[PDB]
Every structure is written in structure tokens, then in C-alpha cells.
Amino acid sequence: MLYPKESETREVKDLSGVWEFRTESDKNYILMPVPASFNDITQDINLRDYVGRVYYKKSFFIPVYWKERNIFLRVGAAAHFSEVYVNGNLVTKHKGGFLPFEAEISKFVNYGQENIIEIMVDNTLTWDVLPPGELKVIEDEMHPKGYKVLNYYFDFFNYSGIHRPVVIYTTPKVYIKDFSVITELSNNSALVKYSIESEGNNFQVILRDKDKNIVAENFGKSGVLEVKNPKLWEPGNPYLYNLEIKLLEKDNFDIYRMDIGIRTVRVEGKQFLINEKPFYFKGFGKHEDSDIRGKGLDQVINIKDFNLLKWIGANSFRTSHYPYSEEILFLADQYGIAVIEEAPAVGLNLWNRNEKVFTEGRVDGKTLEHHLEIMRELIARDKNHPSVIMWSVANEAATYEDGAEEYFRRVIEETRRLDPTRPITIVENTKASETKVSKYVDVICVNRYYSWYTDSGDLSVIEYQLERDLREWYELYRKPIILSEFGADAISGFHSDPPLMFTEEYQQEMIKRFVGVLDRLDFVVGEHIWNFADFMTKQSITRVVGNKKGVFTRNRQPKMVAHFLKERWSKLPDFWEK
Amino acid sequence: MLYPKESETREVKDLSGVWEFRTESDKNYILMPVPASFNDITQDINLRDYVGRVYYKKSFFIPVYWKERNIFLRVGAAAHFSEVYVNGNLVTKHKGGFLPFEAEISKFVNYGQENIIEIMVDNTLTWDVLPPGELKVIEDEMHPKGYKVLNYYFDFFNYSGIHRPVVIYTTPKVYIKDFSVITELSNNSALVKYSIESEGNNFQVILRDKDKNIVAENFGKSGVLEVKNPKLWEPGNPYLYNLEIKLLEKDNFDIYRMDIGIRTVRVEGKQFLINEKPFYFKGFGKHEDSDIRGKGLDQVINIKDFNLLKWIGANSFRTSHYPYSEEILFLADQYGIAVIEEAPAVGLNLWNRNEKVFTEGRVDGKTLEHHLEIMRELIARDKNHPSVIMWSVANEAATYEDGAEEYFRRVIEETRRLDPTRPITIVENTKASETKVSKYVDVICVNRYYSWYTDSGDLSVIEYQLERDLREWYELYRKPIILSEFGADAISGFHSDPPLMFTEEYQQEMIKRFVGVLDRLDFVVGEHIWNFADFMTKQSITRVVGNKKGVFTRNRQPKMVAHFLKERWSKLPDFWEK
Ligand SMILES: [Cl-]
Ligand SMILES: [Cl-]
């Protein structure tokens, strides 16, 4: 499914705005913005911590002239289970809170009249949705009848609601359903190879440069476009060409356009190559999180975040720990930021080797089935973005378990089959010698928190422990390694010398000592600090109103270590043969 | 001009989203969200502090089926001077940064094809725009050639950009252009009297209650709708009826709907009556201000703000110091919050009696002309909102000057002529015996900061000074009095005992002592604390990154005094015969 875009042949109507909202088995509505998480909008603590079904409702008018058009209703994201009703008719259901879903609804609309859309969203986690969790009953001596808790083991808050825009769009009855683009370098040219999915068959395809000059054209539902003297897309030079696809049939006419970038990505030895040059990742793990709206899409915050990425000198980030909005990937295309996009397989770990995760009752064949469908949906959505340069299949799963090996072999095999054009990783906090899964990926991503979660407060252990660990990863697997997470919680304004945990000084010193180690290791091709910004988590005595490891505050202002990273990364080239 | 609303006969296309953006005489664009202020979006300090013209650009497609429709392009707000181009054609110009403007553009569009909209916005202040300011050249021994400053004397930052949504909407060629509604109480019924502006003449008008029951109907371009057993709108009971207007002609058909509220407002003696009951204002001066987006409209923030208003027990606010977005007034209608809406005549004061403001060179006949046009635009926009219950013509002008008397007599006279159905005020910080203007309004609004700006730190003077002052206002003018501003800057987390300026304790103690005085004065009908939330100002040694007098932080979380006000206001009735 293609991102909804207006053209000569397609209308788009955005239903974002103020909706009516209620919780299960309640008749009274309140007002609720869309897109947004509902948790922080009100002062009702029982809604903040609500677990169950909520219902959104809105009126909309369909123009009579949309008859004899396809009418699609698209929901960008709703966490985690959703059902969509048009005038009381169920038009689609969806499982998974971080990818879009849509249905054709012309059969159910009142033309030239009022219509009602209702969207049910259920935030109840189970062990066969990603990320997983479990609702548990607690009726003991200290809890009243009916006390229940939603348990989950990922470290970000279970925000719920409609997190990305709801839109209605039209197409002709015979229309461009999808297309695939692959770019190759050939002699002094680039090739853009394409295939179009449609019931139609007569297509003209045109490629235009930045100045609207036509640089290539082809008649054909599949084909190759040759670009002589191409300008390649890469961090530091985000050149985009505009691909125009025109269906020209007897009764149907359809146009779809997308900006694409010409680049190659390849792993060879201990090098991560973009356009055949050795890349060095400088960046962050991020989160879709901001004040008040929770996980809701906000283009103000998105553009602010990319300007901060360019300001600090980052060239990349990982979409920890789930696919982000398409909007963020289009921006990464424009700004020239390399993206590792990650499936929502986070929380597959009970920090305890006595509780097994990959076992009947928890992560099983049903979870695997969902994970495989997720990879198919994710690659289908994002396969044409130049900014996505790697897929991450999971974050900190219990990869030391025997059952994790067969599980992830299947996930990894399916991902590569779906997209052979990008490398694959998995983000590990398991010990190097214990993971049964990292031997199957292209690039190793390791999260390490020496002197924070272990030997807390003792910065002196970092060089000893980190160098020994990373050398063992390389000795066992002989793959490029990204230090995919490291950092320390810092309360803005907490200062100390000597540095103490939770101060800005400790965060900067820890990060500084980690990267001094990486500079001595020629097989380390990247550093991603956790996290870009402070974000909300569930409440616990270990979380000082959320996770405070941001390099920026939640309102997008820098802590001390942001300036250290700006100075370091201004000296580090994007392409660096270590 | 009516708020753009979809119906059976009208389409609305929202152009908000990501636009291209550049500054004057520069050819390279960056990305910029709309709606938003541009100042805090980037890390370019020279754009943050930019003074001059900026240019927004976006492509849009017009459906061929919009031929033979009116096509209107509406800009919700752009601060402060703006020009709108459709495919290079100037379709309208506008002066004033806080009210909407529109043009019919069907003559300039390419049907079924790409179109380009460009919007120029100029943030350069002058003495004949509201709020006023002046660009000054400073080429002396300590400033290089070309150093210039924009001087202005209002205490909020001169954020600029497109602050409210840009939309395109259709109507039939003969259409409902405007309508006026007035509500009266008669015996046991309410009357909704209406007049419609249109080139058409055959109208059916229907009024529906909350459950869609038809409670009144009338055929006629003007008329009266009788509601037996009306449910009145008021704070604490925001009942809205839906007014449906249907134009039924030979070749044209048009429907427009609006929720309205049935209430009366009247000043009599020292009482402010809503629905013939004595009201007591409990609330705030607000600002259109939030993190990152500046003055840009954000419905997440708006709904959050109204939930906080209901949580703390407020029943009212003033739109300090300019008209707010229509969106906020529709929400105030839904939530039952009484609004004093204020014209942007703030900054008409050089805190210095040697520099006259109402004089040739500063506030003169050109400024007055703009002010009068502003009142006409403001009442035309908001005349049908039940939540607006009073107009404020200015905030803290230099009303002690001889020239201020003739200026404001004309403003006040024109406001009353335009809308005889709502009382009029002006918000004063002049001394009671010195203002030449308050004798002409219906309700006195006085801002007082004893122990903050005067006798700084000495809370012991409050009762002595405030009671004497307010008794003199009543003795001179014999009108109801609202304490329209009072408060203290408080940094969140700054605490002290004994209380010190800038601590949360000092803010709470000051506010507590002020309202203890008000409770002893039967002619005081309201308390508005300055401010609802921390907001940005220009930089100065008196502003600790903006104005810190918020009862809530800028991210909408409560300070200590928020809990004091919640407890007080939970005990104070909305209707209180003092
Ligand atoms: Cl962490
Ligand atoms: Cl102030």
C-alpha cells in the first residue's frame, strides 16, 4: 500500500482533528485529538492507566462526485488491535500498533451526505502481538476484587490511541496499487529498475532531477531507467529524483509520484558500504514520543528533530523499537539521514534466566506468524525509501535460549527473501558467547551499559570491559559491529564533580570513555547513543518520570553531552576507512 | 466570513503540513511545518531573530469537478503583514497577525492539475499595526554598519509565521455568506433570532437539540426560532443546539451548520449577569504559546488546556492579548468557559511619562483606523460564539494621556455599535484617578502587581495597597471590577521559606493574599491570575527565558499555586451574589 498522495487523478481528505472518544461500555463521549495517544490528554488518571477498548467517532461528508471512484480509508497507526466501522459496517481489522491499514469503503458510504466513522482501539497486550505483554489478575490479601495489571517488559510506556493520521483518499477504478524500485550503479550511469502492480498495463514512467528536467523515461509496466551522470543519495548529499508513474488506459487514467534516491548498500568484511564507500554511523536510538501527545505524529516535532540531527552532526538513527511513521522516513530521505528500521520485537525477555521466553505459553508459533506478517507489511511499506539502509529484526530478545535460534532463523530468512537489497541486523544485549542468533545476521548491533547497570558509578571499568567485549564479538562473528546503545540517565540541571550517576557530567564522561574505546577498533563501524531524547516509560522506582538517558530533553533542548557529541562528530567524516 | 466547514454542499481541503520556506532575497528553501511560528523550528539563530519577509510555498491539486464552484483560499492567521499568491497571482493582502483572511481563487487555478500557493509574511512592526513596534537603526561607536533592532513594548515574543491553518474550501455559486444569531429569553421560552447574508433568498432554518430532535424551524432569510423549555448555555452547563441553514434555490443548494448556545449577558450595578444570575469569574489570562511551535495552532495543546481549566475549577479566561484561533472559541463553547476576547492593542505604552504614545509619530489616526477595522473583523468572526461574553479593547495602554481619551472613545463607540449584545471593557494598569478611558466601559479590569513590580519581595504591603486601590476604582466609576491580572514569576523547583521572589512559595502566597482582599469587596466580580502558563518573551535581564508567571509550566504541568487555586475555586460557586 502506497502513501496517500494527491495528484491530477487522486484526492486526499485528512480526517485528523477533534474526534469524539469514549471507553468500553460507556455512553458519554469526551473530545480527543487525532492523531495522539489518549493517555496524557485528560486529567483522568483512570484513563491515563486504562487497559481495554476505546472508541473514536467522527462525522464526514463524501462528495457525490466520488461515485465511480475507489474510496480508501487509511489509518496510519493504532496501538495495538483495531476495528474500523463506516456507518456501522466493519470495513477492516488490524493487529499491530505501528503499521498502517486500509480498506475500500465505497460500498458503505452515503454519497453527498453525512457519514460516521468509528474506530475501536484495544491496548491489551498478549504474547502473540509485538511488542508482547500479558494482562494478569491479582486477587490476593492486599488487592481488592478485580485488581488487574498489564505486565510488559519493554522500556517505553504503553501509550495507546490513534497515533498517525486517518485519511480518506480516492483513486480511479483501475489504478497504481504499488511499485518497486531498485537502484544499481553501472559504468558511469545509474539504473532505476521498476515494476508496477496494477490491473492496468499501459504505463509511462518519467524520472526528473531537482530542477524538473526529465533525465529518463520508459513505456512499460516493468523496466529500467538509465540516469547518465547520476547524483547519488547519501548522508551529507541527499539528492532525490522524482519518479512519475502514469497509467494510460481507455477508461482509466492515474498518476502517482514519489521522490527516490539512487544509492547502494552492501556489507563486505568489516565494512558497511554506502555507494561503495566505508560508512561510519553517528547517531541515536530514537522513540516516537513527545510531551502531551505521547506517540502521536507531529510534524513540528519531526522537523525540529531532523534539524537537531543535522546540528549535532548525526548521520543516522535506529527506529527503536518499532516502525516509525512514513512521514519520518520521507523526512530522512530529504535530510540525508540513514535509518535502521526495526520491527516491534522488543520485550521478548524476562530479565531472568529461570523464566523462558521462547516457549509454549509465551513467544511461540503464533508470535512467529505475527512477526513474519509484520516484516512483510514493513518492507511493503518502506521498500522504496533511500533512507532505510538496514532492517533490525528485534531488540534485546532472549537470544541465549535454544528456542530463540529456530524462531529468528525463520524471521531472518523471510526478511532476506522479502528484501535482498538491504543488510539485516538484530540488536543484542546478550553476551557474545551466549547468543544463538547473531551468527545469522549481516551486522552486529550490541547494547552495552558498563558502569551504569553494572558496576554502577564506577567509570574506571569501561575501557577494560568494553574493549574485551567488543573484541570477542568480532573474534566470534567476523562482522562489522555497531555499538547500538550506550548511555546514562541524566536529570537536566543535576551536576556534580566528581561525576555521580544521574548527573549531566556522568552521562558525558561515560559516553566519552565508550567512544574512545571504539576509535581503537577498526571493526566498529558505528556509535548510536541511547537515547536521542528523554521519553516516557511505565512507572517504577528505576524510572525518574520516564527514561532520562536522552541527549536532548523531551522538549528538544540539549544536555551537556549534546555539545560533546557535536564537537566529536564535526571531526568525524561520514565515510571513514578505519 | 464563516469558519470553513464541510457539508453536503461544501468541501474542505486542509493545506497544513510540510511547506517549503525561505527568507527574503534567498533562493534556497528549507522545510517548515504549517501552522507554526518559524522561530524555534531550526537551529539557525539568525532565523530565530529574523526581521523582514519570509516566503512559504506548496503545491496542491484542484479537482476538475470544482469547476462551477466558488473556491476560497483561507489563511487562519499570519503575523503580521501577508500576501497570498496563487500560481504567481496576488489574490489578497492582509494586515494584522491574529485574524483570518481569504479570497476567491477560481479565476487563478489550473483545474485537474498542479497549482502553487505562495504566502509572504512580514513580521516588521510599525506604529500603525497592532500590536505596534518600530524598526530602529543603531549605527554608533559600538555597533557595526547595518545593525538594526525591532523595538516593541508588549511582553510576549514577536513570533512570526503562518500560525493557523491554511485551507481551501468550496461553496456553490450562490451560497450562505454569513449569518447573525441573537438569543433572548421570553416567558418560559428562548428565542433565537437570525439573519442570513446571501445572494439567495429562500432558506429553511432548523434548530436541533443534543439528541438531534428538531425543536424549532423557520422558512425565511431572517426570522425567529422559538425554543420551549430551553436548556441555557453557561459555565457548568454548556448546552449547545445545532443550527442548520439550508439555501434552496433553483440552481443552487447550500447547507451550513453551527452549534450555538442560548444565553444572555448583562451588566447591572456591580453585578455581571449571565442568564440573569450574578457571575463570578475564576480564571486566567492566557497566551497562544507552546513549546517549539510558538504561536502555532495545536489541537492537542488546546484540548489539554481546556481539561486543565476544568480540572482546576476555572470558568473563564481572557484572550490576552489578541484574538485567538476560532478553534479555541469552539472548544470554549463545548466546555462552557466564558471568554473575554481582546483586540491586539497591547504595547501602547512606553513605561515612561516623558515619552508620549498617543501622538503624531506613534499611535495616531492611522493606528485608530486599523483598530476600528480590527474590531469589525473580530466581531464579524466571533459574534455567534456563546463563549465570548465581553470584548476588551486594549491592555495596559497609556490611558492617562489626553490623546488616549479621544482615541478610545472612538474605539469603544464603534465596538458597541457593531455588537450591542455584549459588555465592553479595557484592561488597565494606569492609576484609577489618572485613566481618562475607564469611565467609558461597562466593567473595570485592573492589573495589579503589588509586592512584585513595586515593593519587590514585601508581601506585607498587599492588603493595605490592594484594598485602598480597588475601593478607589469603585468609588470613582461605580462599575463591577475584575482583578484581571496579578501574579509572580516562579521557576519550577525554586522553593524557599520564608518565601522569596521567583519561588513557588512566593507566587502562591502573593496570589493567596490578593484573593483574600477580593473576598471582602462586594463589587469585585472576578479574579484572573497572570498567567495560565509560562510563555516566551523577547530576551531581557528581567525575563528568565520568557515570562515565568504561569500557574502551569509551559508543558502544561501544575506549579504549587495551581493546587491552591483548585482548592479555592472548588469552594467558590460560578454564580455568587457577593
Ligand atoms: Cl536504558
Ligand atoms: Cl507580567
UniProtKB/TrEMBL annotation, chains A, B:
<keyword id="KW-0378">Hydrolase</keyword>
<feature type="domain" description="Glycoside hydrolase family 2 catalytic">
    <location>
        <begin position="265"/>
        <end position="571"/>
    </location>
</feature>
<feature type="domain" description="Glycoside hydrolase family 2 immunoglobulin-like beta-sandwich">
    <location>
        <begin position="174"/>
        <end position="263"/>
    </location>
</feature>
<dbReference type="InterPro" id="IPR006103">
    <property type="entry name" value="Glyco_hydro_2_cat"/>
</dbReference>
<dbReference type="Pfam" id="PF02837">
    <property type="entry name" value="Glyco_hydro_2_N"/>
</dbReference>
<dbReference type="InterPro" id="IPR008979">
    <property type="entry name" value="Galactose-bd-like_sf"/>
</dbReference>
<dbReference type="GO" id="GO:0030246">
    <property type="term" value="F:carbohydrate binding"/>
</dbReference>
<dbReference type="InterPro" id="IPR036156">
    <property type="entry name" value="Beta-gal/glucu_dom_sf"/>
</dbReference>
<dbReference type="Pfam" id="PF00703">
    <property type="entry name" value="Glyco_hydro_2"/>
</dbReference>
<dbReference type="InterPro" id="IPR006104">
    <property type="entry name" value="Glyco_hydro_2_N"/>
</dbReference>
<dbReference type="GO" id="GO:0005615">
    <property type="term" value="C:extracellular space"/>
</dbReference>
<dbReference type="InterPro" id="IPR013783">
    <property type="entry name" value="Ig-like_fold"/>
</dbReference>
<dbReference type="InterPro" id="IPR006101">
    <property type="entry name" value="Glyco_hydro_2"/>
</dbReference>
<dbReference type="GO" id="GO:0005975">
    <property type="term" value="P:carbohydrate metabolic process"/>
</dbReference>
<dbReference type="InterPro" id="IPR023232">
    <property type="entry name" value="Glyco_hydro_2_AS"/>
</dbReference>
<dbReference type="Pfam" id="PF02836">
    <property type="entry name" value="Glyco_hydro_2_C"/>
</dbReference>
<dbReference type="InterPro" id="IPR017853">
    <property type="entry name" value="GH"/>
</dbReference>
<dbReference type="GO" id="GO:0019391">
    <property type="term" value="P:glucuronoside catabolic process"/>
</dbReference>
<keyword id="KW-0326">Glycosidase</keyword>
<dbReference type="InterPro" id="IPR006102">
    <property type="entry name" value="Ig-like_GH2"/>
</dbReference>
<dbReference type="GO" id="GO:0004566">
    <property type="term" value="F:beta-glucuronidase activity"/>
</dbReference>
<comment type="similarity">
    <text>Belongs to the glycosyl hydrolase 2 family.</text>
</comment>
<feature type="domain" description="Glycosyl hydrolases family 2 sugar binding">
    <location>
        <begin position="43"/>
        <end position="172"/>
    </location>
</feature>
<protein>
    <recommendedName>
        <fullName>Beta-glucuronidase</fullName>
        <ecNumber>3.2.1.31</ecNumber>
    </recommendedName>
</protein>
